[PDB]
Amino acid sequence: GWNALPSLVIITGIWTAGLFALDKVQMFRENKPAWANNKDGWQKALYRRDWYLQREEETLAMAK
Amino acid sequence: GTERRPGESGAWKQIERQRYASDWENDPTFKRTPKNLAEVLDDSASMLLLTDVWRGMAYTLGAFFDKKVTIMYPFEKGQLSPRFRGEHALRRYPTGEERCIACKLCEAICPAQAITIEAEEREDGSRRTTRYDIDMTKCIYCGFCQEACPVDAIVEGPNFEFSTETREELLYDKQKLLENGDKWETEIATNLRTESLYR
């Protein structure tokens, strides 16, 4: 089918471009290529502790 | 295959019958019972894992990689024959005189009553029409007019793409019929040069 082949390639290319753009955007947003990982309360606690520690560092950064 | 099976019957009377009566067994057109492990596995492969859809799927998929018969109208046309009965038209003689002599055979034979004819003798003594009208919205294109005319005056031309935006444009008069004949004379004459061996 030569007439449908253009559509066949276009569908794959469209999904490829969309997934690549979403990858780039979400990588810029989250800044690590693992944010989709499963997380329990333990990993949540570590992440929130780390975020509050970065905020605390910024608070102490504007003190010298 | 064309064989039948218990449970594959699409009804209730027959399904209820076969699950409560062995009448289908007496029927030879029902596939006979498996008798060994091999036949049981064959039956399971028949029912589960499809294996019936698969063949038609493969044939359709081969049709996908197959050629097509599609044509690109209007840049391509179909195949037709000289006997084609299309737009009615009026023919002349090569000197330029109308072939129609108002014998009114065409109007008499026409079962569509779509032909209106008025005629009288011309100033030169010639017997010519004064009104020659055919209702294309009423004409059935049977060609019986072309069969009846003994001077090859009225002909259904090879023109078939003559649709109009209004119905009034299809009320063909003598003048438009003569215009069509003068336009399409060469093709009609060429077809007659072939059809003469049959007509």
Partner: protein, 157 residues
């Protein structure tokens, strides 16, 4: 001002482009001409190639093609379905039975042409017309749609 008029003309061009290339008719399997209509959408002619899809409802139907003779008993139903067609809408007359009655024009129960009930934009002659002729008539319908200029009218209203 000239630029705004130019934009209006281009928008009208695009609107005509969209409306002509996506005409969806409704199926009235009335009589003989439907078989030619059915073969028109078939592999050889491929009505679907020209953006034509037959819909089960008038609500998605863009225009009506009358393929077959119309009786007096059927005229109210045909008017019913046409009056269910949304705007913008059109009507295509295919076949002499639809044109003016033709071979049943003097019958007692035949509506002499679908014109007497509903308006018609395209008249396709033949008993039956060729599927190629139906293609030509629908292309002429596209040509009529092309000359349409709605927003040009509305901006000068």
């Amino acid at each position: 001002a000239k630029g705004l008029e130019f934009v209006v003309s281009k928008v009208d061009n695009v609107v005509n482009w969209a409306r002509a290339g996506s005409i969806w008719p409704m199926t009235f399997g009335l009589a003989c001409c439907a078989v030619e209509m059915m073969h028109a959408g078939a592999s050889r002619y491929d009505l679907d190639r020209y953006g034509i899809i037959f819909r089960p409802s008038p609500r998605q139907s863009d225009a009506m093609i009358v393929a077959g003779t119309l009786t007096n008993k059927m005229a109210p139903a045909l008017r019913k379905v046409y009056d269910q067609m949304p705007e913008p809408k059109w009507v295509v007359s295919m076949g002499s039975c639809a044109n003016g009655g033709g071979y049943y024009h003097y019958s007692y129960a035949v509506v002499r042409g679908c014109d007497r009930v509903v308006p018609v934009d395209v008249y396709v002659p033949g008993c039956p017309p060729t599927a190629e002729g139906l293609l030509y008539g629908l292309l002429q319908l596209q040509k009529k749609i092309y000359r349409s200029k709605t927003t040009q009218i509305w901006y000068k209203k």
